[PDB]
Write a protein that binds this ligand. Sequence first.
Ligand SMILES: COc1cccc2[nH]c(C(=O)N[C@@H](CC(C)C)C(=O)N[C@@H](C[C@@H]3CCNC3=O)C(=O)c3nc4ccccc4s3)cc12
Ligand SMILES: COc1cccc2[nH]c(C(=O)N[C@@H](CC(C)C)C(=O)N[C@@H](C[C@@H]3CCNC3=O)C(=O)c3nc4ccccc4s3)cc12
Lengths: 299, 298
Amino acid sequence: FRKMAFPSGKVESCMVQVTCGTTTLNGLWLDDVVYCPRHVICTSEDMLNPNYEDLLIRKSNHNFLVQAGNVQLRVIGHSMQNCVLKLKVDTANPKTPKYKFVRIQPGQTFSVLACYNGSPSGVYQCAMRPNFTIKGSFLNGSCGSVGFNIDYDCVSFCYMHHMELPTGVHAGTDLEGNFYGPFVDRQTAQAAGTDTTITVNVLAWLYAAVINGDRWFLNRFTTTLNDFNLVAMKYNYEPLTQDHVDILGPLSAQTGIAVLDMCASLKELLQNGMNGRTILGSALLEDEFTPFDVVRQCS
Amino acid sequence: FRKMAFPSGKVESCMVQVTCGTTTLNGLWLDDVVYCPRHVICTSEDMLNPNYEDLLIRKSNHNFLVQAGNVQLRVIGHSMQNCVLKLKVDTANPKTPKYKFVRIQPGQTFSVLACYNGSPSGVYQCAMRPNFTIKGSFLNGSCGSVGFNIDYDCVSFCYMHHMELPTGVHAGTDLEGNFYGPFVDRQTAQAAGTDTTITVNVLAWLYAAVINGDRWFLNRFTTTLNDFNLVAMKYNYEPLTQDHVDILGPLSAQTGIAVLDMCASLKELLQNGMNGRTILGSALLEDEFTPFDVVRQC
Ligand SMILES: COc1cccc2[nH]c(C(=O)N[C@@H](CC(C)C)C(=O)N[C@@H](C[C@@H]3CCNC3=O)C(=O)c3nc4ccccc4s3)cc12
Ligand SMILES: COc1cccc2[nH]c(C(=O)N[C@@H](CC(C)C)C(=O)N[C@@H](C[C@@H]3CCNC3=O)C(=O)c3nc4ccccc4s3)cc12
């Protein structure tokens, strides 16, 4: 059981480079539109307080250099949607996948295709944290990299990359250009809200460990949902809802371990520690696998 | 630091399925050849101790069903090379990337594109253990999935998947069909050697820590390579080779910390423990990031 990203080929065929003046970042080319972070139009003396509508009206189509591989794409129009710029180009992308734009929920996972200069560099899994940051791996020039899920050849784009916080975690928008969390696309040091642990994911991961032949952390005890949530909240874990319990049903039925029995296992791990032992190779409780991630991989 | 796979598109375009009878494995289509594990020709009562040479003489080109999706590729020749079957087909793959077949060493990492019935399902990074197993994620139907690295658009294929050991780790071949480690392609419970920690990668991790300002473990000692290797083996760490010293060269230059000085730092950590301190936030030393991976992410 490992962190597993979706195959990235359908998305790689959509990554382009977008240059405005001195600024170069990545864009996403779908049909005849290139989506990219709007601050491609900012110079260094603009990043602190950019009045984006006022900056954009001053730009012409020919101010935008869009490159797909070695081929330049001519911008024939542009519009802004929140923090995303939509460049209309004179060529539709012939490898546009079936796709959707979705806004994901905290606790859900996606694959990130990290890109530099329009060229894909790496792919890895991320969870949307409860405080709406992600713990990614992004360097200078990574803006415009996207996150996505795939379901039967349909690519659901859910993230475009914009920012690395002082703490080293990452912030970005959906493909409508609305940030996840309270972040703003200006060159300022921004703090996130206090993060918490994704309880339903930790439980899914404990089930994954049992499916894979590890049972050492189980115990003979049970707990009520509310008593578990009282302890969970004390340890900065998100509350577990009945919807979460239902969602864990399939994993519960596969292993024969009731959800509240697994909650009693996690309660013991929170109160007693792991005592130097490991689960699925980790010395820490892992919260970035969803129940679906476990089912998709183990089955 | 994240375990980061290579973008998989160039390899996705090369995955096909190969069927003999009711047995379907994944295959790799490059130019006009498809490569796949040879036991696609096996029946269930042939798997304990297959006579592959005998089994292959009873096969003709027309017994092999090669499909890209639902599109059949006609087989015009077949041959066996070690544990892989090479099927010549009448169509050169137009999406064949620039490629090489390489045989990797323990400690080297690569991306695995897990595939089922020729259809790619997920991608993740793996490290070849010193006992020549990988800690993969493979189910029934995964054989023929490949592992690879990508350097300047050239795909270096290094792994093809064959087997899950009773311990749950995985074993396979290079693309010439030679197994990594002492394993054989038979339906049989096989044990790997006792595994060890990948010293060269731990050193890379320590260099990554220094690069990021976490350097409490640096000391004013040095060691010879031989003295280090004798200590390392007593803690179940791999001995360093000359090649390991050389691949740590760029990180040593970047930090100004000689390789043997970092070895003396690691030796101290082995003999004395971390004493509750951490390195890069972790109480455990990471051994699945190569010097290349560290440079990639730093
Ligand atoms: C005093 O200001 C700070 C104080 C403390 C921490 C801080 N973080 C950031 C911050 O992240 N800024 C954004 C840009 C803002 C405008 C959204 C930014 O540089 N995004 C990167 C990805 C970054 C870079 C490093 N790895 C990350 O993922 C991206 O590619 C883009 N680069 C530029 C460069 C110039 C113009 C546009 C873009 S868009 C500022 C900052
Ligand atoms: C008493 O025998 C055992 C005792 C204790 C542990 C054991 N492990 C294996 C073992 O691995 N066998 C090989 C096959 C051998 C011939 C290399 C095998 O099933 N490979 C799988 C990938 C496996 C499956 C589960 N996840 C893993 O990665 C693969 O895809 C292939 N499937 C077939 C199906 C039919 C024909 C060819 C192939 S090749 C046997 C075994």
